[PDB]
Amino acid sequence: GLVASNLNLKPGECLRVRGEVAPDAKSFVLNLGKDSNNLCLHFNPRFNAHGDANTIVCNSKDGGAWGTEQREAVFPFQPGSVAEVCITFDQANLTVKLPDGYEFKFPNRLNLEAINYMAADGDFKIKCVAFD
Amino acid sequence: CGLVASNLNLKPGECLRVRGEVAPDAKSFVLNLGKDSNNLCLHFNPRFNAHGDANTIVCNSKDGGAWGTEQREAVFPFQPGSVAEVCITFDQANLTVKLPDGYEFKFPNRLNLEAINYMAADGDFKIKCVAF
Numbered sequence A: 001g002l003v004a005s006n007l008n009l010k011p012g013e014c015l016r017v018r019g020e021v022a023p024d025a026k027s028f029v030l031n032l033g034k035d036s037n038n039l040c041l042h043f044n045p046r047f048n049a050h051g052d053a054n055t056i057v058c059n060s061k062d063g064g065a066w067g068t069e070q071r072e073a074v075f076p077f078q079p080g081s082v083a084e085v086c087i088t089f090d091q092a093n094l095t096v097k098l099p100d101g102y103e104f105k106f107p108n109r110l111n112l113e114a115i116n117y118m119a120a121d122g123d124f125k126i127k128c129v130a131f132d
Numbered sequence B: 001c002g003l004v005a006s007n008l009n010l011k012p013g014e015c016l017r018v019r020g021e022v023a024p025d026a027k028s029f030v031l032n033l034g035k036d037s038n039n040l041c042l043h044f045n046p047r048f049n050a051h052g053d054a055n056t057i058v059c060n061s062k063d064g065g066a067w068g069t070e071q072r073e074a075v076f077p078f079q080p081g082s083v084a085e086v087c088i089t090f091d092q093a094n095l096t097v098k099l100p101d102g103y104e105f106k107f108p109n110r111l112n113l114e115a116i117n118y119m120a121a122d123g124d125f126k127i128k129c130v131a132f
Helices: none
Strands: A003-009 A015-021 A028-035 A038-049 A052-062 A081-089 A093-097 A103-107 A115-122 A124-131 B004-010 B016-022 B029-036 B039-050 B053-063 B082-090 B094-098 B104-108 B116-123 B125-131
Touching: A003 A124, A015 A028, A015 A115, A028 A124, A038 A081, A038 A093, A052 A103, A115 A124, B016 B029, B016 B116, B029 B125, B039 B082, B039 B094, B039 B116, B116 B125
Parallel strands: none
Antiparallel strands: A003 A115, A003 B004, A015 A081, A015 A124, A028 A038, A028 A115, A038 A052, A081 A093, A093 A103, A124 B125, B004 B116, B016 B082, B016 B125, B029 B039, B029 B116, B039 B053, B082 B094, B094 B104
């Protein structure tokens, strides 16, 4: 999927990503961070993958090492449909806003002062990216 | 270097919209489109005051690392310290570039691209949003 670099997203700004969830989607990923080996956020909604049904799985990656994984409480995504995710962050946490008025915070484990990398994988085609 | 995006997958007939902020003391900026960084269907280079050119848009392509013959446009609907949006589509024969103030120009699809998968911004132009 889409790979963007030099995003230079800073605290106080909002990264908006809108796209299309494939009609027969099994899962999709949104990775954010410094680069492919340093992710402040691995956002992985699973419709049906690795034995999981309708669950968002999140984690970080530091120097290539995956951190402690966690399943989120909600799943506001549907196969074959439009969905927008919005991310902001500060020194301590990332805030992830999801469809249907849901949102959750994820610890800023890497202590990132900026987000410069984003990569989409799986059954999700990004159609629009906005800053602020 | 500004935002760099790959795996865009822009198909013929689809419109790529790029909106950004022209810096207050902008000398020039670049929008590169193509297959990848070495194969550009469009090097879009508005020059406010650079390389001896004043308020002039210069375009060219790059094929396998080789720059083609540069092309000068006849309009310059840009001004430092403001927002500007450019829209691009293509077919087999030309790309069509739509500029502010209702201006537009065509550039030959020299590399015969059937998709645009790469986009990069450079210079005094900060991308606020990209849609495709």
